[PDB]
Design a binder for this molecule. Structure first.
Ligand SMILES: CC(=O)N[C@@H]1[C@@H](O)[C@H](O[C@@H]2O[C@H](CO)[C@H](O)[C@H](O[C@H]3O[C@H](CO)[C@H](O)[C@H](O)[C@H]3NC(C)=O)[C@H]2O[C@@H]2O[C@@H](C)[C@@H](O)[C@@H](O)[C@@H]2O)[C@@H](CO)O[C@H]1O
Ligand SMILES: CC(=O)N[C@@H]1[C@@H](O)[C@H](O[C@@H]2O[C@H](CO)[C@H](O)[C@H](O[C@H]3O[C@H](CO)[C@H](O)[C@H](O)[C@H]3NC(C)=O)[C@H]2O[C@@H]2O[C@@H](C)[C@@H](O)[C@@H](O)[C@@H]2O)[C@@H](CO)O[C@H]1O
Lengths: 292, 285
């Protein structure tokens, strides 16, 4: 099988961290910044890593059964289809959100509905946040019971003076959590390409969430199950009307994309209607032409 | 030609933001539907309001403006580019769950403070004019400016009534055409998802990833129908035969008293061959 990437323009691609559409590419202000996102992670051969699910509609979702303690309430987590979550070789159930170090606000419904079926579960990333072992605590102004299924609606700071940094991941343990490994900028002047989406972040530097692979790229790799035939895949980002090559990018086997950004610029200066196309297999050391 | 190499339970609904729970046929197997989302030809032509991504499904974006009785939205496309009242029934991705109230959770696309969410309560009555590019709402919050959001739940238009999610809206005073069962014992296959419906699952005719697959591929149609096998991914056994039509829907011949609702929900659809219109399917379920 021959490796391809989706024939879909950037703006029709979904974020792999939050339920939203991609609106631009960028590079990090610190081009040496290392990330360890647990969603949007998939090898070129189609191996899912971390908590990464297959579908865009599994991204940043939570399902579980409500339980009561002396102190309050929690969810005993299940997979999103309701099957049992077993602590094995994943940080959390598939699709579980990976926006670290902040409060989450998750809108859920009970899976004969009457009145208002929604509950907003407010979740702190403090001590009883133990998704790896299979439970989290929440508070809610509503009264959720039983089998609740929902989606991350918005995020806010853990404490009043603080901010939300969407570039961080949670601490899944309460303990080895089987995390997808860190991603380093791989040298040769290359910077990791991040795909950004608008998302309601309260007290963030911006209201945007980065990811390292568009969700449709993930499912494409899973479907295709293609053999890696080189150290990197050279891609062109192409204008779909003129077929002009707008810039060179490298797609690495571990499942992320790089470019060489022009000083003070980068892929954030490119049109957002282009399509990535596989060009050829290249050596790890292939030197890219600068973009932006 | 290929269809997505992905088990059914990892496929998304194309009419609501939810995962596929199961397949079924309609109780009345001659029932005609006209869904506006989840519609795409085999060659990759989007129809109705159907978008490419599962994260565009059943979403609304617009600018808040003042109406006679309160507030409304002047619609835009989901990416914030202007909506033109033209050939589509509405902005791409606009919900198509007809004849009911909608409850849509939105945020202001901006710096945020406090509670950034508004729930827009939308009735499909006189001012509901999505083709022209406007709808009205009531809300217990105070949304302003550029609001982007997703359908959260639905309820009855009036007290005592029931929600029928098999209906589509009236878009106002290029609708995707109806899907007719083709005859010969074949029944349209509907893909069902759990979704919060007060006083009622939501059906669709193509899982969303089938749509992006067709768009992505731009495959030539080389026969009158595509014969698909539904395969157990763990034993690799063929669990049943289905036909995929060029206009973009799927059929089976359901066994009497049964049907694809009796099949496991973790199987994978696989293209087998091109067949003629009247290729007779082995019954399933
Ligand atoms: C118990 C006590 O000493 N104080 C409680 C208040 O903190 C609760 O109201 C708080 O109002 C704050 C703003 O005026 C703030 O909204 C706070 O939580 C909110 O902000 C924090 C960070 O500062 C987080 O971002 C939260 O996610 C966010 N919650 C929202 C926006 O809904 C409010 O209290 C929060 O929720 C309570 C239950 C506790 O978990 C606090 O730690 C949270 O901060 C309110 C309690 O309901 O009044 C007092 O009880
Ligand atoms: C008493 C007062 O001061 N004002 C009255 C309003 O409260 C009434 O609003 C209705 O409140 C109901 C709850 O008691 C209910 O929420 C109703 O809508 C709900 O039920 C309808 C079907 O009957 C739909 O299913 C709605 O989706 C559902 N809404 C939910 C669950 O949130 C309310 O009426 C709706 O909202 C009002 C403002 C109007 O827009 C109606 O057309 C809507 O149906 C109000 C009802 O007419 O009467 C006031 O006097």
């Amino acid at each position: 099988r021959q490796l391809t990437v989706p024939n879909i323009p950037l703006n029709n691609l979904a974020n792999s961290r939050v339920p939203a559409m991609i609106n631009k590419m960028t590079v990090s202000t610190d081009q040496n910044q290392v990330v360890q996102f647990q969603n949007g992670r998939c090898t070129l051969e189609g191996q899912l890593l971390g908590t990464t699910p297959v579908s865009a509609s599994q991204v940043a979702r939570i399902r579980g059964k409500v339980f009561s303690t002396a102190s309050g309430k929690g969810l005993n987590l299940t997979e999103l289809d309701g099957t049992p979550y077993h602590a094995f070789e994943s940080p959390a159930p598939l699709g579980f959100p990976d926006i670290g170090a902040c409060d989450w606000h998750v809108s859920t419904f009970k899976v004969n509905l009457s009145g208002d079926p929604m509950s907003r579960l407010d979740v702190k990333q403090n001590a009883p946040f133990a998704p790896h072992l299979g439970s989290i605590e929440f508070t809610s102004d509503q009264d959720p019971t039983g089998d609740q299924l929902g989606t991350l609606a918005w995020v806010s700071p853990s404490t009043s003076g603080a901010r939300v940094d969407p570039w961080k991941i949670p601490s899944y343990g309460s303990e080895s959590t089987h995390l997808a490994p860190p991603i380093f900028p791989p040298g040769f002047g290359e910077a990791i390409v991040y795909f950004m989406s608008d998302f309601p972040i309260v007290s963030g530097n911006t209201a945007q969430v980065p990811c390292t692979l568009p969700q449709e790229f993930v499912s494409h790799f899973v479907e295709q199950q293609a053999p890696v035939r080189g150290e990197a895949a050279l891609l062109h980002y192409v204008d779909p009307d003129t077929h002009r090559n707008l810039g060179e990018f490298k797609l690495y086997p571990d499942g992320f994309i790089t470019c060489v950004p022009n000083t003070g610029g980068g892929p954030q200066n490119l049109p957002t209607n282009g399509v990535f196309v596989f060009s050829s297999w290249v050596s790890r050391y292939y030197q890219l032409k600068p973009v932006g």
